Design a protein around this ligand. Structure first.
Ligand SMILES: CNCc1ccc(C(F)(F)F)cc1
Ligand SMILES: [Zn+2]
Length: 140
């Protein structure tokens, strides 16, 4: 589990969004596994605006942060998981590491702040939903 908290925004995996996230929806995209909902309190987090290919993610299934290299966000075939069928996901970054379904929502960070959230796993990769393209997360 987990989310990004930037301004009056809460960024979560679409597949883990609550009734309340949907009830206060801002934006959502199933191709990205992303949902954004409005928040009453303001958030501690800063979004990266950059093309860094190195950073650190939280792995909740190892209670550990791991430094990774990762591909630029792209349109990737992900095999079938407990929360999705085998499908094309867009704006996805892949690194070599550990990701179980429960690890979705853990942060990936670089020197510029939050890059994305764990969204895929299996066959020794960890996939992350890029949010660096979402410039509207920074104001309003
Ligand atoms: C509920 N969201 C559905 C969805 C939105 C956008 C796309 C894409 F951009 F890829 F065309 C695919 C699926
Ligand atoms: Zn960066």
């Amino acid at each position: 589990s987990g989310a990004i908290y930037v301004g009056n925004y809460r960024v979560v995996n679409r597949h883990l969004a609550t009734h309340n996230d949907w009830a206060n929806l801002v934006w959502e995209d199933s191709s990205r596994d992303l949902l954004v909902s409005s928040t009453t309190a303001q958030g501690c987090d800063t979004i990266a605006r950059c093309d860094c290919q190195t950073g650190v993610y939280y792995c909740s299934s190892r209670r550990k942060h791991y430094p990774v290299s990762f591909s630029k966000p792209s349109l990737i075939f992900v095999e079938a998981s407990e929360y999705y069928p085998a499908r094309y996901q867009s704006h996805l970054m892949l690194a070599v590491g550990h990701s179980e379904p429960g690890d979705c929502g853990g942060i990936l960070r670089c020197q510029h702040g939050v890059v994305g959230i764990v969204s895929t796993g299996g066959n020794g990769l960890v996939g992350f939903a890029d949010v660096r393209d979402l410039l509207w997360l920074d104001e309003e």
